[PDB]
Predict the structure of Alpha-(1,6)-fucosyltransferase.
Amino acid sequence: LGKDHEILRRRIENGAKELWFFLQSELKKLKNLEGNELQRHADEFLLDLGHHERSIMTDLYYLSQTDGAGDWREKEAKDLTELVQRRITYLQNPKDCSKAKKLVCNINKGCGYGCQLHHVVYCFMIAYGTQRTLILESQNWRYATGGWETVFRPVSETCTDRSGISTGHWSGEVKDKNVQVVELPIVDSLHPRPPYLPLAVPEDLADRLVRVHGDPAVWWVSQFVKYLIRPQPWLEKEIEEATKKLGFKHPVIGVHVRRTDKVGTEAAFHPIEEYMVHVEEHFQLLARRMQVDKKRVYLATDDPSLLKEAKTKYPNYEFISDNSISWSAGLHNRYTENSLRGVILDIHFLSQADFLVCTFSSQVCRVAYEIMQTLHPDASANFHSLDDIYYFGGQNAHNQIAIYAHQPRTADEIPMEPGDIIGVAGNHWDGYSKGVNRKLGRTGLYPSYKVREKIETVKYPTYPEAE
Amino acid sequence: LGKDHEILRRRIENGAKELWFFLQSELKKLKNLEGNELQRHADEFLLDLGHHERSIMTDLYYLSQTDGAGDWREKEAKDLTELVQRRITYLQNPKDCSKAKKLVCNINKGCGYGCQLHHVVYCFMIAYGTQRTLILESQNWRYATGGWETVFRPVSETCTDRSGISTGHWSGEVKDKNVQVVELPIVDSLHPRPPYLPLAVPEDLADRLVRVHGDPAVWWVSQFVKYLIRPQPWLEKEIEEATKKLGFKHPVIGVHVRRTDKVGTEAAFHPIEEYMVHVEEHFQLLARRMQVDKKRVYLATDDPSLLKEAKTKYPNYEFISDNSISWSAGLHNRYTENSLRGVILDIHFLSQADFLVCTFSSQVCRVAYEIMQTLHPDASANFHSLDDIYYFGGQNAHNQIAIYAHQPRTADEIPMEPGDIIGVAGNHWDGYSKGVNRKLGRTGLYPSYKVREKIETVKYPTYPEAE
Ligand SMILES: *[C@@H]1O[C@H](CO)[C@@H](O[C@@H]2O[C@H](CO)[C@@H](O[C@@H]3O[C@H](CO[C@H]4O[C@H](CO)[C@@H](O)[C@H](O)[C@@H]4O[C@@H]4O[C@H](CO)[C@@H](O)[C@H](O)[C@H]4NC(C)=O)[C@@H](O)[C@H](O[C@H]4O[C@H](CO)[C@@H](O)[C@H](O)[C@@H]4O[C@@H]4O[C@H](CO)[C@@H](O)[C@H](O)[C@H]4NC(C)=O)[C@@H]3O)[C@H](O)[C@H]2NC(C)=O)[C@H](O)[C@H]1NC(C)=O
Ligand SMILES: *[C@@H]1O[C@H](CO)[C@@H](O[C@@H]2O[C@H](CO)[C@@H](O[C@@H]3O[C@H](CO[C@H]4O[C@H](CO)[C@@H](O)[C@H](O)[C@@H]4O[C@@H]4O[C@H](CO)[C@@H](O)[C@H](O)[C@H]4NC(C)=O)[C@@H](O)[C@H](O[C@H]4O[C@H](CO)[C@@H](O)[C@H](O)[C@@H]4O[C@@H]4O[C@H](CO)[C@@H](O)[C@H](O)[C@H]4NC(C)=O)[C@@H]3O)[C@H](O)[C@H]2NC(C)=O)[C@H](O)[C@H]1NC(C)=O
Ligand SMILES: Nc1nc2c(ncn2[C@@H]2O[C@H](COP(=O)(O)OP(=O)(O)O)[C@@H](O)[C@H]2O)c(=O)[nH]1
Ligand SMILES: Nc1nc2c(ncn2[C@@H]2O[C@H](COP(=O)(O)OP(=O)(O)O)[C@@H](O)[C@H]2O)c(=O)[nH]1
Ligand SMILES: [Mn+2]
Ligand SMILES: [Mn+2]
């Protein structure tokens, strides 16, 4: 047993006990306050609590690193990524393209870049599950009509041809077993659905992923994002130069403020303050474990007026942003190579940040969070979403398991017993989540701490010939 | 790295995050409430918080046991106590008593049994530090004219005679080096003070103790308590029979309610409810990790009227108590063997409980807590004191180290910067502790979470010839 592990475990324990002592005492006083005295005392209470909570979180961070846990988690996440990229690379590069089984994906989904890239991700995972080489058709891509290879490497070096002695539209892995070339539709219309879909992870990796990562579902998705966005030389250089021209250095927190056409249809308008309270909380947390010279935000937004508002409102922050990129994102110019490369850079710099604050309703932020998983052993928690939890559009049902019983106080709450399967719809970031107790057929609110994530697995191929 | 260790670390981490989400939302609601609606919602808040907090503490319990940590902690705590008892036993049993260096302690200190027992402990620790065999003089012991051996085994099998070619009163380890027999006074008057005093622990054991135990100072004291209280046969049998006749079985929580002459000069009167809120909270905590058939309290008190009050007020509790022992403890009849036997048994059963609720101002409770440390790997945290933190009367200055800065909000508070040495006077069990900032000469309140205990060491002998 390690001395620092044991000291830290006890300090976390004691810090939580003193937090409970503190709460009881202060809440008892609050009960006897009125008017402004109550609001003064409640605000001072919350200030004191935040620092206290962060001390506990900081000690838990240190506990994650003791006794070589940091070096090990890093080495094991490296091996898991090398192994999956090895297998993906093997599947995508057969010797004989003319005889290879293939899956054809068309990039041209009626949506934006994040949605299109996630369509390709979904095609790829199904290609990997069916041992079919992914063929990406990208001519007339609305963002770059020359296609994918305008920015990214081709998804194969040996097999980009879709020819085959037999071709058909997806009808299921069993029916298609002797169809050499299968055309896959968008997940929104896929029938029948195979099991090679999020949020499940490969059976053969599940136990190693749980040791390392707090949301293996995202890690698994992130491996296909990693392979897809391998840059062309010139895109690599453009990112290196942008990194230099902008002052992009750590520590930095990425903020994605999505507006324009999203507002009303798929998400709400969120004022800048809703993002920056979390940014400030997380610089306060970082400052407890490292020197913070200056507070840097990398701001990606499709509102080109925001940067001036943010700078004015938060003068102690250094905002790193390319406002011309933000202009490029207006619908007058969104579907152009100029705008495409802008969102690719914005996503890259969000992904590279130390923490991410955004709306997960936006595919852009999700892509950045997915990529972030490839830059750390476990970045599963390095985010705040103002609205949705992580999801992958088209995923199978995201179920939780109740670990503690719940008795509803209001009719907006659902009851739970341990073992009950809970279909989560969201976390409200207030202590409560929303979902359906599938056992009871009842939908409503439940305390987020009383459930556990249900990791789902699938028997994927293991590509042993890749070793 | 262990799957269960990592899952638990993340669930602790996430449980604390949801606790902070929960606090913010509910406090913001409370700010806008008045009157009874405020008190209803604040009481419901505190109920909700208690279960949430207990979930976090329960997960922290499980993390302490993962990956064989429990088996390891137990083996190492067993080895440490076998080693120290081996050394103490060696020191106490020289082959040649006539030539042995000796330290003479007189039990008849002007106080009660726990105080007299700690006087013997304090003599013993200095005896162990000076390589002198402890000679205990106990004739005319107020509790027993037969002496120590009325209840306990003699502290030596070979050397109980106090003879020597040279005898003197303590004058310091160096001056007394050629004095064969040194008479030690009470700690209240010991001058000059040697280093072999609480709360310091031996140099040679500290790194192992910090790995195993959350308060090494108490563990060290407990090793001498362990040796002293080896019972005579009749007392050993009395303890076994009382165990059966009282129905003493686990789970059980010990409660010591000290009144009579303690009240006013050395401690306050505390109503039974002040003890039982903690008793109930800790049965609620136990219930999260084991089935609790019946809630047993072992009640030790010198108030013979309390047991009937407790049973009436807490009818779902099973109170295990010996009211005739409590009657025997009255001031009028306190100092006789039957009463000595009573407090030895009461202390024994408090020590054997799963948790201890009492006033650490009472020497009776401190003995029980000390003995408890010998029955578990790390029972340093198995207690609630309504007043004092652990202390050993006569101890050297109990210092803490400030780890996080504090800016005082009121004139009741002291400032702290990291590294400041804090002489603690108490924990108020409300989030705040009381002490002196030695750097500044400032006395007052500080958040308890902003300090760390300062473990003190002393170069004691290691008695290698004992192996
Ligand atoms: C057209 O273009 C589209 C992009 O513009 C493109 O992408 C699609 O875009 C839509 C709109 O953004 C997006 O829909 C969202 O999907 C979220 C995921 O829903 C999943 O997973 C959640 C858990 O997170 C479950 O609760 C859902 O039921 C659903 O699971 C389904 O499960 C079944 C089995 O039970 C499976 O068979 C299905 O496969 C599976 N579906 C999917 C899609 O995987 C969902 O959370 C979003 O709902 C929220 O936003 C709505 C507004 O857009 C609100 O009306 C709704 O109430 C939700 O509000 C949230 O409520 C929470 C709880 O109170 C709060 O905490 C949140 O803050 C709050 N959020 C907001 C924003 O208010 C929403 O439905 C698709 O996922 C996405 N699809 C893909 C593939 O990318 C389309 O594909 C394009 N179509 C074409 C034909 O080209
Ligand atoms: C006569 O019989 C006695 C039997 O009762 C016998 O034993 C003595 O008994 C007394 C009374 O019970 C007992 O006094 C208590 O000692 C506590 C320990 O004091 C230590 O440690 C604390 C930290 O825990 C320090 O803050 C202290 O300053 C002191 O440290 C001293 O440090 C110096 C160097 O700095 C050393 O050189 C000294 O050796 C060292 N002193 C000692 C004694 O070791 C102490 O905490 C107790 O104080 C509290 O209770 C008092 C009432 O008894 C209150 O007046 C006082 O304000 C304290 O209140 C506490 O305040 C906290 C903060 O606000 C709260 O959290 C607490 O809830 C609150 N408690 C209560 C109960 O209200 C008290 O002084 C002796 O320790 C004990 N001595 C021995 C050796 O057993 C005598 O020896 C007999 N005499 C003779 C001649 O035979
Ligand atoms: N450069 C840049 N473009 C953006 C930003 N936000 C939105 N866009 C553009 O608007 C599109 C939104 O479509 P999509 O990626 O599917 O994300 P979603 O609509 O937010 O769910 C993006 O792909 C970009 O083309 C941003 O912060 N920076
Ligand atoms: N049997 C028994 N005796 C007690 C109890 N509380 C106090 N006494 C008696 O009162 C004495 C108190 O003296 P002491 O041990 O120095 O403890 P303190 O006064 O509480 O600090 C004890 O030794 C007992 O003789 C109790 O709960 N049970
Ligand atoms: Mn946060
Ligand atoms: Mn407690």
User: Anything to note?
Assistant: DSSP finds twelve helices and 16 strands in chain A. Chain A has three domains: 1-67, 68-396+455-459, 397-454. The CA atoms of residues 239 and 345 of chain A lie 7 Å apart.
